RNA sequence: GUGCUGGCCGCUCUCGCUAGAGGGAGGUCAGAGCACAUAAU
């Protein structure tokens, strides 16, 4: 329960043979580097034509036997021990010190490096080679692997509408229009009703009209955009290039030294300056930074101790803000990295370990992330907690609830094996969205709409026709230096630049105050990205926006643990949501977990299926109020409900955490899960269901691959979950008078929502 | 210590001109509070 971190400082000065040490390490690091990968057999593709070409790893195999000869079982072996690491690979340095594996081979290749005698030397130069060489296999094997599933879903996905739309997708370009998701959807509803004015679109719709696209019209919503994913997806797939690149070399490389006989080095903090002293290659002189703020550093047989807390950097010499000063952080050092950056500075990195307690770890990887904890887990669980739930979305960022539960304690909530609880703070919303979330979505669809005005202009260009009213009329409203219909795309261009502008002006100037309301110009500018690379492709028929993208994923990091702070757990819905895609659907989840256990709180994730449609308290499904997104509408006991989405969303977070995810909300006619559910709420797993009465299942111990739905403790069928979803819609068609029924109420007996004991 | 900010001013490239709009280096004047696990991709 010690959790790894970094950071680095600047070097200012140095004395000593320093430079030629490093230069030294970087030389040889680069040559040899080269050799030891290409004995290993990786297939790459030619940077020198952007990847059009490749080598395939038949042809590796061919040169590195062509290389080695009659060793390459040796250096095979050797290779292998060096990639999986560990202790055995801990005292094999022996590749370059000329005092097992690679003992041998340098009498088979007769291999040097620079300074063959200088044990630390050839140490750090291992390995720097080492972690360059497992950096860059893991991104191999998960590159071959996410290519091999990505043409295999494509490989499984076929259909007479998959063909049609490739065959129109054929004739668009022909036509040079160029194929997406909202024409596709358009045309096929516009092609239904004859037109009669141009509209925006034309030529699509024109040319759905023969019978050879009969296939599409009669298709079924699903199975039009499951074609049009498995298109784009076969795009991508055609397009990406075979294999991964090998690696730069002649970028410079972070050089690893410690105290684990690498090398020597003494930390002594005075009041100006850090000092690193090697014993040799001189020392190095290091200003202080603000992330190290108070540094202390204390000798320790084979660790430092540094005691350290953050500061804020204002910069500004008349800064109008109060300096605050965060808590003590009590840090353990074994190493520090140095670096030069191409910009041409040093920089000294300290790898710092934190201590925590492993408690709230254990209990959020074995019991809350498994339907079978072991006895052993429940005898070892304390009998009191605190947990909490987060529902992320783009508008009311976070929506948090906090329970306290505990074994021998009564209250409203059930948690499966543990005992009961109830609501310490209420259901609520964290922070409502600022006032300038509004105006950073207009600004976003102009610029999509810039885009689809971009591409008809070309094929209508192309084909000799007139634009539509519609377009003319929309992009005339704009001051233009004429009238043309190329001028009034610039003209609008440079007023969408100038809005994002004065915005990235302004939020930057209070430090991005607001988090909700940054993840708005986030989209407007990924947005405005793509408008400008179409634009300039109409004949040819960055660093600091992937920045801002990291700043904000680590900022709602941040306001998410600064809340829980009290918390031992909190439950996060398996994002494998419109804010999942913009930040990233494997990043956010990642910094969280960080930010999180930065404090030693534990992080569990629970199925996403069905947590924004049940009743929290009553546990039947209820109907999502199209119209405003913000209500949910029930039906008990001939009373109809309105609740709260994203508190209920939160509710039912919380419940499927207490339960483990065991109580499934759909399945077809397994896994542990539903396995479990079985085995408790009916006798046993392995029975077979069949229909009865009127949509409802009975089961005996018939049907198969159909929609089983669970509401109010009964199994139904698809046909009768449509019907009660028609039943509430009609009711809230009619205006019946619902209730407002609040998840905070200390009245309430139960909430039996995925509870199926 | 690292990251994220525009305004203006010449130069130099890519498409269009009933017309300009974007890209890259550099100069200069203002802004500047709140995050950090670093390397790569
Ligand atoms: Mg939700």
Request: charge should be positive; include cysteine; glycine fraction near 6%.
């Amino acid at each position: 329960h010690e959790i790894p971190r970094s950071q680095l400082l600047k070097i200012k000065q140095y004395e000593g043979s320093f430079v030629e040490w490093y230069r030294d390490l970087q030389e040889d690091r680069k040559k040899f580097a080269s050799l030891l990968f290409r004995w290993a057999a990786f297939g790459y593709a030619a940077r020198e034509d952007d990847g059009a070409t490749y080598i395939s790893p038949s042809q590796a195999l061919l040169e590195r036997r062509l290389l080695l000869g009659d060793a390459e079982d040796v250096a095979i072996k050797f290779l292998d021990v060096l990639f999986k690491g560990g202790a055995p690979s801990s005292s094999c340095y022996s590749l370059f010190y000329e005092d097992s594996l690679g003992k041998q081979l340098r009498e088979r290749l007769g291999i040097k490096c620079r300074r063959p005698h200088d044990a630390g030397y050839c140490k750090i130069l291992m390995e720097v080679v080492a972690r360059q060489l497992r950096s860059h296999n893991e991104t191999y094997h998960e590159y071959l692997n996410q290519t091999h599933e990505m043409k295999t879903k494509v490989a499984n996905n076929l259909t007479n509408e998959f063909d049609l739309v490739c065959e129109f997708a054929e004739v668009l370009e022909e036509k040079n229009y160029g194929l997406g998701w909202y024409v596709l959807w358009q045309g096929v509803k516009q092609a239904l009703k004859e037109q009669k004015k141009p509209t925006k679109i034309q030529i699509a719709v024109d040319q759905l009209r023969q019978p050879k696209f009969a296939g599409l019209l009669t298709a079924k919503w699903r199975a039009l955009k499951g074609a049009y994913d498995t298109w784009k997806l076969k795009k991508r797939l055609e397009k990406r290039k075979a294999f991964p690149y090998m690696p730069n070399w002649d970028n410079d490389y972070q050089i690893p030294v410690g105290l684990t006989g690498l090398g020597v080095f003494t930390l002594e903090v005075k009041r100006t300056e850090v000092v690193v002293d090697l014993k040799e290659h001189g020392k190095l002189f290091c200003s202080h930074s603000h992330y190290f703020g108070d540094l202390t550093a204390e000798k320790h047989p084979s660790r430092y101790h540094l005691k350290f807390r953050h500061k804020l950097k204002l910069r500004k010499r008349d800064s109008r803000v109060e300096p605050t000063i965060g808590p003590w952080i009590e840090a353990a050092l074994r190493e520090i990295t140095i670096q030069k950056k191409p910009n041409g500075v040093f920089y000294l990195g300290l790898p710092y370990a934190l201590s925590h307690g492993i408690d709230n770890f254990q209990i959020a990887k074995r019991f809350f992330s498994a339907a079978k904890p072991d006895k052993e887990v429940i005898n070892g669980l304390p009998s009191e907690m605190v947990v909490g739930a987060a529902d992320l979305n783009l508008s009311n960022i976070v929506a948090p609830v906090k329970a306290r539960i505990g074994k021998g304690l009564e209250g409203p909530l059930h948690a499966l094996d543990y005992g009961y609880g109830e609501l310490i703070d209420g259901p609520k919303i964290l922070t409502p969205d600022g006032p300038r979330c509004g105006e950073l979505i207009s600004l976003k669809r102009d610029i999509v709409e810039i885009k689809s005005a971009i591409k008809e202009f070309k094929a209508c260009q192309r084909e000799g026709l007139t634009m539509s009213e519609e377009t003319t009329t929309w992009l005339s409203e704009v001051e233009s230096p004429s009238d043309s219909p190329r001028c009034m795309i610039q003209s609008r261009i440079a007023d969408t630049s100038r809005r994002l502008n004065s915005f990235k002006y302004q939020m930057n100037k209070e430090g991005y105050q607001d988090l909700a309301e940054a993840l708005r110009l986030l989209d407007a500018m990924d947005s405005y990205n793509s408008l400008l690379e179409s634009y300039q492709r109409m004949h040819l028929s960055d660093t600091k926006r992937a920045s801002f993208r990291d700043l904000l994923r680590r900022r709602v990091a941040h306001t998410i643990v600064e809340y829980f702070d009290d918390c031992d757990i909190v439950f996060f819905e398996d994002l494998d949501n419109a804010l999942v895609k913009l930040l990233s659907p494997r990043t956010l989840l990642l910094y969280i977990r960080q930010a999180l256990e930065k404090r030693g709180i534990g992080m569990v994730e629970v199925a996403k299926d069905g947590t924004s449609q049940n009743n929290p308290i009553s546990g039947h499904v209820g109907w999502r109020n199209k119209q405003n997104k913000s209500e949910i509408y029930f039906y008990e006991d001939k009373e109809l409900l309105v609740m709260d989405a994203d508190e209920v969303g939160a509710m039912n977070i919380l419940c499927r955490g207490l339960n483990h995810s065991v109580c499934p909300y759909s399945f077809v006619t397994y896994g542990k899960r539903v396995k479990r559910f079985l085995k408790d709420r009916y006798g046993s797993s392995n029975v077979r269901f069949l229909v009865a009465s009127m949509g409802f299942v009975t089961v005996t111990t018939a049907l198969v691959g159909k929609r089983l739905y669970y509401h109010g403790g009964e199994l139904v069928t698809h046909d009768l979950h449509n019907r009660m979803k028609d039943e509430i819609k009609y009711l809230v068609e009619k205006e019946v008078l619902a209730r407002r029924v609040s998840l905070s109420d200390s009245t309430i007996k139960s909430y039996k929502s995925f509870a199926h004991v």
